[PDB]
Curated annotation (Swiss-Prot), chain B:
Gene name for this UniProt entry: ocd
Keyword NAD belongs to the record: yes
Keyword Ubl conjugation: no
Protein name from the UniProt record: Ornithine cyclodeaminase
NCBIfam families the UniProt entry points to: PRK07589.1 (NF005762)
Taxonomic source organism: Pseudomonas putida (strain ATCC 47054 / DSM 6125 / CFBP 8728 / NCIMB 11950 / KT2440)
Cofactor note text: Binds 1 NAD(+) pers subunit.
PANTHER family: KETIMINE REDUCTASE MU-CRYSTALLIN
Pfam families reported in the protein's UniProt record: OCD_Mu_crystall
Molecular function, one GO term: ornithine cyclodeaminase activity
Oligomeric form and interacting partners: Homodimer.
InterPro entries to which the protein is assigned, alphabetical: NAD(P)-bd_dom_sf (IPR036291), ODC_Mu_crystall (IPR003462), ODC_N (IPR023401)
Sites where the protein binds L-ornithine: 44, 68, 111, 227, 293
Names of required cofactors: NAD(+)
One GO term of the biological process aspect: L-proline biosynthetic process
């Protein structure tokens, strides 16, 4: 079993570059989504608590199995901890052997930005150039760069209740001269006249970050922040006024923005759109919404990507997580006599 | 986050002792089973393949969250790999922070033996002295010692289709002079006149290791080997002649021996027996069956036990699995500039 810890992932991402990492991952995600029906899918298992949730996100095909452990505690930042922390494993289906154990906190931000990018490439109007970024925390820089470097976004209007978060975002990306990022005094001000609205706020409760009055013809909404029951960012009527796209419907019906609508509210499966079998955006005036909550297949993709890229660079360290090949695999007792 | 790998767990178990480890764990398991209602329980999630299964087993209470990754591939031994491999994590509920990452292959054998022991103490006749052990692989030595050291079993009659497995079992426990382990040439021969039958065979299919004609009044069956849909060890009629006990009913209805019986077939929750809310064994002549498939609470208990035992010994290695406290927890992007 190989292990990629936080500093090693940092070196890997730094080497590949955040922009290329996101672009290459989006391409890999698109191919895996097209192969949707080849995967053994399931809604992630969630263990809710008073201030957060801890989830396990498994998925697999005929040769590889993958899963991610991840928590979502919005109040963590008040204690100097990340709202989102994660790690995962890529394993061999025919033996059950865990080939890679990897940090996935940094990787989650990367796959989430890549997934949002993939969805936008297929759903947003091709002439998009301005985006509103509501929520300027951990996910924000990644979302900003994904859209700037791969979807032609030149101007971002940002807003966060915490002004220091916005300052951080602007400072982190100032080095990208082709991108202008400016602070707005409110959500309504930030979203005025934008082609794309990305929401990545963290608040474990029902919230109406985006209301019907803010919608303009042709907009694409990248709703990422809400991702579990009782945690939303869009007013229910925003969804009723748009064509809604999802990752894994069974899971999104419960955790996504659509949890606020009748169980029969029509949504479109993103993988069908990517295969060109179902219509995505139907007109230039239409409002499209990517009701994103995160799905195990995305973690499977980033885990496979990380393994391949780390191997090529000889990065990672071996760990004795489980027994390897032994003379007598039925003699587990031999391990009780000491190393 | 601290990490306990295979060799470290080996040293830890060696220092505690297999029998003591099992005994202390059984006591800890009893306490956790008693507060069964305090846990957020769920049936484990499984991913099935043609040769095996890979499962995630989570459980949590108000303070701790735990989960185990584990596979079950009966054909692995032909490739010199273990049929069962596992690892898990114990985390803080109010922050989601993973405190311990630990190997759980060795630990699984220990908690399974402890669970079987705990069940047997409440279900088997208190005067049991002889046990049949069908399947002499990885789990066998642990099951053998649990019963010998904590349930007064002085004699074990063992059988395995692989004669080298039985030889391994006998040689491994020869040092325990108070325990006699003899090889039988068939399952029928091995179970004749025993007080307890422990089955830990590995075969991904519907097997009738134990048939009705083998049953004798007063027996307790510790059915451990079968643990998923389509994988059983007992003939359905064996269950019809017994009082059947389970771990987490919703999960066992799907994966246990009872998957072969009506959805309405009566079963008894082991935790309720331990709480004294319902009976375990009701008569000396009764046949009791612990339909064991494994449940996340057991892994939660062993993870907590391992953490405690490792801490007082200063064992375990720090690993950077996830970020810890930082000046600005909202600046994850700073981690993309390299470790330097
Ligand atoms: N859809 C997915 O795949 C996916 C994966 C990434 C994370 N998540 C979700 O993304 C959200 C953000 O994650 P993060 O790591 O950036 O968290 P974070 O805590 O680092 O940042 C969230 C930011 O939102 C701001 N915020 C909270 N309420 C607000 C409001 N009403 N208006 C404006 N700003 C507000 C906070 O001040 C904070 O800076 C979380 O809710 C998380 O669960 C989803
Ligand atoms: N209930 C639980 O909590 C729990 C936890 C431990 C493992 N499991 C199950 O326990 C079983 C055994 O695990 P292990 O690690 O010892 O595996 P193992 O492969 O090391 O040993 C199993 C043994 O069974 C023998 N066997 C197979 N078919 C047989 C038959 N028809 N008659 C007699 N012997 C036969 C094999 O030759 C082998 O030596 C597996 O099926 C596993 O999934 C259950
Ligand atoms: N707070 C993070 C929760 C998990 C997230 N929805 C994901 O898909 O990773
Ligand atoms: N094939 C998966 C086996 C896992 C075992 N039943 C356990 O409870 O650990
Ligand atoms: Na969302
Ligand atoms: Na069983």
């Amino acid at each position: 079993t190989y292990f990629i810890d936080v500093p090693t992932m940092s070196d890997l991402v730094h080497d590949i570059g955040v922009a290329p990492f996101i672009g290459e991952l989006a391409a890999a995600l698109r191919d895996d989504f097209k192969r949707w029906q080849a995967f053994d899918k399931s809604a992630r298992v969630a263990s809710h608590s008073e201030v957060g949730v801890i989830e396990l996100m498994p998925v697999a095909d005929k040769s590889r199995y993958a899963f991610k452990y991840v928590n979502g505690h919005p109040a963590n930042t008040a204690r100097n901890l990340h709202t989102v922390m994660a790690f995962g494993v890529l394993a061999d289906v025919d033996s059950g052997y865990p080939v890679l154990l990897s940090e996935l906190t940094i990787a989650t931000a990367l796959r989430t930005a890549a997934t949002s990018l993939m969805a936008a490439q297929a759903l947003a109007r091709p002439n998009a150039r301005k985006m509103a970024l509501i929520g300027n925390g951990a996910q924000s820089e990644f979302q900003a760069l994904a859209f700037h470097k791969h979807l032609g976004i030149e101007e971002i209007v940002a807003y966060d209740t915490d002004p220091l978060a916005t300052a951080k975002l602007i400072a982190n990306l100032k080095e990208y001269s082709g991108l202008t990022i400016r602070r707005a005094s409110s959500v309504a001000e930030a979203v005025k006249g934008v082609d794309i609205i990305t929401t990545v706020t963290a608040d474990k409760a029902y919230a109406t970050i985006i209301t019907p009055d803010m919608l303009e013809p042709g907009m694409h909404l990248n709703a990422v922040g809400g991702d579990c029951p009782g945690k939303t960012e869009l007013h229910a009527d925003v969804l009723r006024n748009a064509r809604v796209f999802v990752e894994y419907e069974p899971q999104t019906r419960i955790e996504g923005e659509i949890q606020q609508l009748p169980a029969d509210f029509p949504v479109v499966d993103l993988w069908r759109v990517l295969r060109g079998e179902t219509e995505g955006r139907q007109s230039d005036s239409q409002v499209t919404v990517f009701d994103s909550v995160g799905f195990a297949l995305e973690d499977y993709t980033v885990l496979r990507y990380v393994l391949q890229q780390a191997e090529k660079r000889g990065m990672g360290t071996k760990i004795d997580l489980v027994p390897w090949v032994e003379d007598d695999p039925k003699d587990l007792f031999s391990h009780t006599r000491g190393r």
